[PDB]
RNA sequence: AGCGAAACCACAGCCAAGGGAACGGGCUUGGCAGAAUCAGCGGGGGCUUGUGGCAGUCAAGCGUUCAUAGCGACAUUGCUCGGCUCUUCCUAUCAUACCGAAGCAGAAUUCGGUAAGCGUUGGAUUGUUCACCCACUAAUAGGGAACGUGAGCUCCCUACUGAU
RNA sequence: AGAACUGGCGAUGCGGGAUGAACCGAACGUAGAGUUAAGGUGCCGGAAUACACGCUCAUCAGACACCACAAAAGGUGUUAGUUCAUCUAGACAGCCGGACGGUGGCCAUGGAAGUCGGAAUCCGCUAAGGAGUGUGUAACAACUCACCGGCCGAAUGAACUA
């Protein structure tokens, strides 16, 4: 409707400290650091009390007003990602052939191997994004854990671990094989 | 190859780990994909879609009216 | 459903032979074009009347599609009796065919076939639903009646099944005429 | 791709379609 | 354009709105003069067959519910806004659940009844539960490993998808049986419960939560006295 | 190496589109274009599409007043003288490519999507061809380029291939 | 299609419409100076990359020309309106709680408890609960919205019009 002054609020907890010059956003805290460019979006950040940040948008169109709310979230997720961390648990299932997932340190880049999946001699090598760590679930059969700071690194790498395990030209119902994200959560549960 | 071969598979192994998620999310995306398709889909693909969408709209007009007229009786 | 389609097949041929014979005498474009629209119009109306049989033929396309292929000449052996005697626990271990063991009435509504080999020779064991006339009842009755087979009737000498042993005796004498 | 030039036979075969819409309304 | 189009419903019930609020507004004001004693109940969470049991206990005394703000304005909010004398003092004290009761009976017969009345109900959100519920490391049952396995029926394979997502528990299914690898524990004695911690114990049908209905303020019509008592 | 015509001749001869009138060759808007010359070919001169019409329960609105001057959208009720080579382009795709859906177990099938990159056969009939059948293959898709290749069939100008 | 009337071209140049028989202006001696018509003023092009208010993003926008044909509609594109309704007696959205008692209504039947069906869709309790909107089960359960209520604190929703 052409608003005049559209602002949100970004609540900053006591651990983390935000730095925003132009539209580049740093979140320095307990777990480490996160930097993000937001020049593409074009808004106005306003520190108010070291504890609340207001992004405003003047003379906005509906499409520019939208762009504002998604900025609160994408800074919120940069804050929650350091104080609390992001952990994604993936359980993998099968019918006959047990999937023999391992991690290789080839060229120091860290990949995830996918072997024998639905009886494959094709070994599916999946990259691991930096920031995100991999560990196998102890005392739980056939399960792998993806834990990192950023929501992107984590969930995208979860997605690349899942999408490699389609069943080519078969049934959805009959064939159960693959890797699926079981549980979405936090590193520090509180 | 029995008589309910896939239904047993369900009643013994389950659908998927993720079959409720892909389903539910596809139900939501539809509202967008419909609008994307009614904006795209040039030519005869679209001229059928708009005519499909109208028969979907008169059917709904009937269903709403014939329910709220027989609310009294 | 075999005869309405057979009448429809000879109707779409009847539209093509008639309207084409009318079209070669269409002088202007607007006569020529309309008679095409008339041709497909009459064709469509035949197809639109067929929405009743072709939905049933879809249900039969899937049901005949999953139906077992039994052979009447092969060495067949029917497995029968009251619902949940232990006939499902019988076919489970004698041959590798998944039959559900669940403590209620009509567990298996259909014919379950179990292939096995003895003395280097081919045999097959056919499970029946269960008898008390209903459609599920009539399938089990005509299973022994028309197939060249030996009937394996099963009874229980305990509190299990739910049905009395006395009911199994009166079952045998009443359905005696066929087996 | 389609064009955006009006050929004159059309540009004036619009006027002669528009004139036919004038005499149609009156009757 | 672009908005969330609401789920199209063809239900046989119509929206009450203001035609119900007016019917309650007059019913509170008509019951103030007919009866003598009034109570206000903080009934935290209430099963319907429990409410009808309080109803069928006595037909003489009236139970009043609805909106809190309906119950403030029909009675009185301030010293100016009032129907009866010192009627606003009882309305300021009740802030939780709406519950109210008009009575013509004795004071001691009411308060002794409600202190003794404690019922079996499910574990509730944000409230503690006095059990350490552990599930067996094999096939799970309808009770969840409290009664012997022979008495109980194995759980339905249809509900297991919900067990993984909302109830969280790491569940795999073999031959139509819900199975967990390790003996799971959900709750402990003397700990505040979350929503999922509550609903697990609601699904298994465990009634390990005491329900005692409490009452607060007390009023007499002809005397205009406001009495405050904290029972549980 | 010599000798040596004629026919013919308003004038020039690059594409693309537009120039209303089976008129483009000079005009308009573009692409473009370097002097000079030799050898080939047989080279040229807002139309329409997919669901019939007839009577009707329809039923949003418009009808001077407004359902009864009366029409009325999608639906549903009734009857019922052609075809053999060689170029190019189109997608409305027959195969091949990747997906989406299906009681699709597997193998195969059907429907649908993006795609024109690459492919698309052989035999008995010709009283006017105005019909088709089994043989293979991954599949043997439909069309346009008007008298397409009827000046390949029953000493006018220049594009092009190259050469100095 | 035919009839009547009045123009235009025919005997007719000139400015404009990129170009033109039918449109816009304007009917011509030879010149200079001024002013305009119709049409324009990003550049090709002489003339404001003027001012002012809005609207529009198009995967071949639009500048398409009595707004006439493909046009009746479709779209979770967008801007404005019109007419009904809730709204600090707390609405819209949202996790939370209830969502009941004759009753597992009645015929159908191995099995029907709201939910494979057929005809009624009653009555009581209340704040409100449909002899029931779906998931699911052999049948039950559990879930479900619809109807309330609590936690939050203001504008929101529906049908349309342009």
Curated annotation (Swiss-Prot), chain A:
Classify the source by domain of life: Eukaryota
InterPro entries hit by this protein: Ribosomal_uL6-like, Ribosomal_uL6-like_a/b-dom_sf, Ribosomal_uL6_a/b-dom, Ribosomal_uL6_CS2
Task: Extract the GO molecular function terms from the UniProt entry.
Answer: rRNA binding; structural constituent of ribosome
Q: What is its main location?
A: cytoplasm
Q: What does this protein do?
A: Component of the ribosome, a large ribonucleoprotein complex responsible for the synthesis of proteins in the cell. The small ribosomal subunit (SSU) binds messenger RNAs (mRNAs) and translates the encoded message by selecting cognate aminoacyl-transfer RNA (tRNA) molecules. The large subunit (LSU) contains the ribosomal catalytic site termed the peptidyl transferase center (PTC), which catalyzes the formation of peptide bonds, thereby polymerizing the amino acids delivered by tRNAs into a polypeptide chain.
Q: What else is known?
A: Present with 52400 molecules/cell in log phase SD medium.
**Can you name this protein?**
Large ribosomal subunit protein uL6A
Instruction: Give the source species.
Output: Saccharomyces cerevisiae (strain ATCC 204508 / S288c)
Taxonomic lineage: Eukaryota, Fungi, Dikarya, Ascomycota, Saccharomycotina
Curated annotation (Swiss-Prot), chain B:
Give a Gene Ontology cellular component term annotated to this protein: preribosome, large subunit precursor
* Start and end residues of each stretch annotated as Disordered: 1-42
- Biased-composition ranges, Basic and acidic residues, are 1-39
Annotated GO biological process: maturation of 5.8S rRNA; maturation of 5.8S rRNA from tricistronic rRNA transcript (SSU-rRNA, 5.8S rRNA, LSU-rRNA); maturation of LSU-rRNA; maturation of LSU-rRNA from tricistronic rRNA transcript (SSU-rRNA, 5.8S rRNA, LSU-rRNA); ribosomal large subunit biogenesis
UniProt KW keywords: Nucleus, Ribosome biogenesis, rRNA processing
Compartment(s) of residence = Nucleus, Nucleolus
Motif Nuclear localization signal 2: where in chain: 50-57
Signal peptide (residue range): none
Disulfide pairs here are none
Q: Where is this motif: Nuclear localization signal 1?
A: 14-21
Partners and quaternary state? Component of the pre-66S ribosomal particle. Interacts with NOP7 and RRP1. Interacts with RSA4 (via WD repeats).
Which function does this protein serve? Answer: Involved in the biogenesis of the 60S ribosomal subunit. May play a part in the quality control of pre-60S particles. Under normal, rapid growth conditions, high levels of NSA2 would allow the progression of pre-60S particles through the ITS2 processing.
Give the note: Present with 8660 molecules/cell in log phase SD medium.
Family according to the record = Belongs to the eukaryotic ribosomal protein eS8 family. Ribosome biogenesis protein NSA2 subfamily.
Q: What is the name attached to this protein's record?
A: Ribosome biogenesis protein NSA2
- Where does this protein come from, organism-wise? Saccharomyces cerevisiae (strain ATCC 204508 / S288c)
According to the entry, what is the taxonomic lineage of the organism?
Eukaryota, Fungi, Dikarya, Ascomycota, Saccharomycotina
Region of the whole protein represented: 2 to 74 of 261
From Swiss-Prot, chain C:
Q: Tell where it localizes.
A: Nucleus, Nucleolus
Annotated GO molecular function terms are: GTP binding; GTPase activity; RNA binding
Q: Give the main localization category.
A: nucleus
State if Phosphoprotein is listed as a keyword. Answer: yes
Q: GO cellular component annotations, sorted alphabetically?
A: cytoplasm; nucleolus; preribosome, large subunit precursor
Oligomeric state and interaction partners are given as: Associated with nucleolar and cytoplasmic pre-60S particles. Directly interacts with RLP24.
Q: Please, what other remarks does the record include?
A: Present with 28000 molecules/cell in log phase SD medium.
Q: What is this protein called?
A: Nucleolar GTP-binding protein 1
This protein's gene is called NOG1
Parent protein range shown? 94 to 278 of 647
Curated annotation (Swiss-Prot), chain E:
Q: Which GO terms are recorded in the biological process aspect for this UniProt protein?
A: maturation of SSU-rRNA; nuclear-transcribed mRNA catabolic process; ribosomal large subunit assembly; ribosomal large subunit biogenesis; ribosomal large subunit export from nucleus; rRNA processing
Gene Ontology terms for molecular function: large ribosomal subunit rRNA binding
Q: Name one GO cellular component term.
A: cytoplasm
Q: Name one Pfam family in it.
A: RL10P_insert
Q: List the disulfide bonds.
A: none
Remaining remarks: Present with 18200 molecules/cell in log phase SD medium.
Protein name, UniProt field: Ribosome assembly factor MRT4
**What organism does the UniProt record list as the source?**
Saccharomyces cerevisiae (strain ATCC 204508 / S288c)
């Amino acid at each position: 409707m052409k608003y005049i002054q559209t602002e949100q609020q970004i609540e900053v907890p006591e651990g983390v400290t935000v730095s925003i010059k132009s539209r580049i956003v740093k979140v320095v805290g307990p777990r480490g650091t996160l930097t993000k460019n937001l020049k593409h979006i074009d808004v106005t950040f306003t520190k108010v009390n070291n504890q609340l940040i207001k992004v405003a948008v003047h003379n906005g169109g509906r499409k520019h007003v939208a762009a504002l709310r998604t900025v609160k979230s994408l800074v919120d997720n940069m804050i929650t990602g350091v104080t609390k961390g992001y952990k994604y648990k993936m359980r993998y299932v099968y019918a006959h052939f047990p999937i023999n997932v391992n991690i290789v340190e080839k060229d120091g880049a860290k990949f995830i191997e996918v072997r024998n999946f639905l009886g494959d001699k094709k070994i599916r090598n999946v990259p691991v994004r930096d920031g995100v760590t991999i560990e196998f679930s102890t005392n739980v059969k056939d399960e792998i854990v993806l834990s990192g700071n950023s929501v992107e690194d984590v969930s995208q790498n979860a997605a690349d671990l899942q999408q490699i395990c389609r069943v080519r030209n078969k049934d959805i119902r009959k064939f159960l094989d693959g890797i699926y994200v079981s549980h979405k959560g936090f590193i520090t549960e509180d | 190859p029995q008589n309910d071969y896939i239904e047993r598979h369900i009643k013994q192994h389950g659908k998927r780990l993720d079959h409720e998620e892909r389903k539910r999310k596809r139900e939501a995306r539809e509202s967008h994909k419909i609008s994307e398709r009614a904006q795209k889909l040039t030519g005869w693909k679209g001229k059928q879609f708009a005519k499909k969408r109208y028969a979907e709209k008169v059917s709904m007009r009937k269903k709403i009216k014939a329910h709220e007229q027989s609310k009294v009786k | 459903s075999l005869a309405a389609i057979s009448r429809a097949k000879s109707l779409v041929e009847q539209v093509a032979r008639d309207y084409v014979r009318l079209l070669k005498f269409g002088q202007s474009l607007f006569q020529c074009k309309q008679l095409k629209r008339a041709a497909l119009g009459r064709m469509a109306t035949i197809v639109k009347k067929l929405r009743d049989p072709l939905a049933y033929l879809e249900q039969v396309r899937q049901h005949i599609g999953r139906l077992p292929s039994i052979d009447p000449n092969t060495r067949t052996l029917l497995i029968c009796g009251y619902p949940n005697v232990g006939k499902s626990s019988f076919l489970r271990c004698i041959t590798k065919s998944d039959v559900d063991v669940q403590p209620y009435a009509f567990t298996t509504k259909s014919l379950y076939v179990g292939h096995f080999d003895y003395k280097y020779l081919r045999f097959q064991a056919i499970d029946t639903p269960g008898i008390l006339m209903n459609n599920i009842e009539m399938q089990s009755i005509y299973a022994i009646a028309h197939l060249r087979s030996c009937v394996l009737y099963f009874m229980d000498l305990s509190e299990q099944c739910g049905f009395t042993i006395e009911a199994q005796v009166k079952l045998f004498h009443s359905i005696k005429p066929l087996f | 791709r389609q064009s955006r030039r009006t050929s004159t036979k059309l540009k004036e075969g619009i006027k002669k379609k528009a004139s036919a819409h004038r005499k149609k309304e009156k009757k | 354009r672009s908005k969330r189009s609401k789920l199209v419903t063809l239900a046989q019930t119509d929206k009450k709105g203001r035609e119900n609020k007016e019917r309650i507004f007059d019913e509170v004001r008509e019951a103030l003069d007919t009866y003598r004693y009034v109570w206000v109940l903080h009934l935290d969470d209430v099963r319907t067959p429990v409410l009808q049991e309080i109803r069928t206990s006595w037909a003489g005394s009236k139970l009043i519910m609805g909106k809190r703000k309906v119950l403030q304005k029909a009675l009185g909010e301030k010293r100016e806004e009032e129907y009866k004398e010192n009627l606003y003092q009882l309305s300021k004290l009740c802030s939780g659940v709406t519950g109210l009761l008009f009575t013509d009976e004795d004071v001691n017969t009411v308060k002794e009844y409600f202190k003794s009345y404690v019922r079996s109900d499910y574990s509730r959100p944000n409230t503690k539960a006095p059990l350490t519920f552990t599930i067996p490391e094999g096939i799970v049952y309808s009770r969840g490993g409290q009664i012997p396995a022979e008495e109980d029926v194995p759980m339905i394979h249809s509900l297991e998808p919900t067990m993984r997502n909302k109830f969280e528990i790491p569940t795999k299914i073999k031959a139509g049986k819900i199975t967990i690898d390790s003996p799971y524990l959900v709750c402990t004695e003397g700990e505040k419960l979350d929503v999922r911690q509550a609903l697990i114990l609601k699904q298994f049908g465990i009634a390990a939560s005491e329900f005692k209905v409490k009452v607060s303020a007390y009023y007499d019509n002809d005397s205009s006295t406001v009495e405050s008592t904290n029972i549980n």
